[PDB]
């Protein structure tokens, strides 16, 4: 339905990831809730874990408006298990805020977003 | 004399270094990876300065750590420093957490800067 569209970016592929960056730079935050699993968790860098696609949304609705977020590399390693480990590292910024950022996703047999965590990072200053 | 834990995404011999001499308890090997000016910086004890210092450090803080280090990614800037970041595990037999190290390398791949994040271990 969303006609956000997906697009290998960064040298990510994972179905999964492009969705969850295309719907969130959208703001298309049910959707990018939907990728979650029922019981998937987001770690935001300066909160308590988020627990399920409704809360989810909703946390994305009121801390997420205005984001933009931009990955710049990606790295997935599916271990044996059957679950997928994905690293992305870029940038976000509102028009007042900007971090270096490292996104880590695990994904279950299906694709679907156990956790999220984010986390941030400082460039080479000093 | 020690084991290289392969890393997925990374080949940069610094970074393959650190693991597998901490991982061996050679810390004075572990410290001299550092720049003399370089930086380490742990979850729960601010901030150590120079391989002397950081040799010492970890022989006495970090004996029988065993870190598995899963993924990378690198990252060089224009002023020719390499930021590397791991994704991975590290324990104890009776203490276990999920890490982030946060590696930034000199133009000669010195380490002049590490911080170790937590990340969520009781997830489930």
Redo the contacts between chains.
Sequence with gaps: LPNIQIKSIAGITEPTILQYFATLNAGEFAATAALFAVDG?M?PPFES?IVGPDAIAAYLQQEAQGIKAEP????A?TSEDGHT?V?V?GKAQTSWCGVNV?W?FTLNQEKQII?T?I?L????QE
């Design positions: 968790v770690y874990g710049q590399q990606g790295l390693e480990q690293q590292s490292l880590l956790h965590q986390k990072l400082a460039s080479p």
